[PDB]
Amino acid sequence: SVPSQKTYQGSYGFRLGFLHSGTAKSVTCTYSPALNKLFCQLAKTCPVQLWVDSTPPPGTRVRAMAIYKQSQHMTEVVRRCPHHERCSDSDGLAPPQHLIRVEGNLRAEYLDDRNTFRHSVVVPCEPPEVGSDCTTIHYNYMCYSSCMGGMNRRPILTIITLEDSSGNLLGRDSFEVRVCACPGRDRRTEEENLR
Ligand SMILES: O=C(O)c1cc(I)c(-n2cccc2)c(I)c1O
Ligand SMILES: [Zn+2]
Alpha carbons within 13 A on the beta-carbon side of 16: 26
The answer, yes or no, to whether any atom of ligand 1 lies below 6 A from the CB of 125, is yes
Contact (Cβ atoms closer than 8 angstroms) between residue 29 and residue 40: yes
Alpha carbons within 13 A on the beta-carbon side of 96: 10
Domain boundaries, the chain: 1-195
In sequence order, what DSSP letters do the residues of 132-160 get, joined into one string?
Answer: -SSEEEEEEE-S-TT-TTTTTT--EEEEE
The answer, yes or no, to whether any atom of ligand 1 lies below 6 A from the CB of 131, is no
- Kindly provide the resolution of this structure in angstroms, with one decimal: 1.5
> How far is it, in rounded angstroms, from Cα 120 to Cα 136?
18
Contact (Cβ atoms closer than 8 angstroms) between residue 137 and residue 124: no
B/e letters for 112-150, b = 16+ CB within 10 Å, e = fewer, are eeeeeebbbbbbebeeeeeeeeebebebbbbbbbebeeb
Proximal ligand: closest to the CA of 164? 1
Provide the β-strand partners of residue 126: none
Distance between Cα 86 and ligand 2 center (Å): 9
In sequence order, what DSSP letters do the residues of 41-86 get, joined into one string?
Answer: -TT--EEEEEE-SSPPPTT-EEEEEEEESSGGGTTSPP---TTGGG
Environment class of residue 154 by beta-carbon count within 10 Å: exposed (0-12), middle (13-18) or buried (19+)? middle
Is 147 labeled as ligand-binding?
A: yes
CATH number of 1-195: 2.60.40.720
Which residues, in sequence order, are CB contacts of 106 under 8 Å at separation 6+?
A: 93
- Of the candidates 49, 25, 29, 51, the one whose C-alpha atom is nearest the C-alpha of residue 40 is 29
> How far is it, in rounded angstroms, from Cα 128 to Cα 148?
39
